[PDB]
Amino acid sequence: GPGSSSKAISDISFQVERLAGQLSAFDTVIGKGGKVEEKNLENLMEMLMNQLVKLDAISGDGDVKLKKKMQEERLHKYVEALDLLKIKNS
Template sequence: MEVDKLADQVSAIEKAVSNGTKVPEVQITTLIEMLMRQAIKLDSISTEGDASAQKNLQGKRVQKCVETLDALKLSNGKVKPVVVTTKWETFDPPPTTAHWEFFD
């Protein structure tokens, strides 16, 4: 269940970065550390049979999440923050000279 929660957080960060939102690097690093702790817990569990296969699947899942976060950390650094202002730019309207006046 813990890996599921962390994987959901990875998905949320992935979605935010793909939408152009800059995620604090500390948030990504913390999530990587939490995933690594889960990997250590998985390694310390002794299993046999189907439980061993399940443990291996969870281990691969944790590894994939960490790899995803590493890639996101790089692309997140390239995201330029979007600046939103409430001051609108105005443009001067084009001259109101009639088209046929150019053919005199």
């Protein structure tokens, strides 16, 4: 139900910002001339996408979908940034 939905989205948001933290680290490393293992850029890609499917699987109406929305929208932004890091790195 509702509470169960607000909950699922909240857990994901929490994991998503932890994922953004790892992306930010890769971004700075690669941005400063350093190198990052390709498999790590790939492992991060699957984690972001994994959160995205988990999100979509969640159903809800009202604030519950407004939240999930900005969340998968944020995830889209991260996946696309990571696509550019992969190009810039390898």
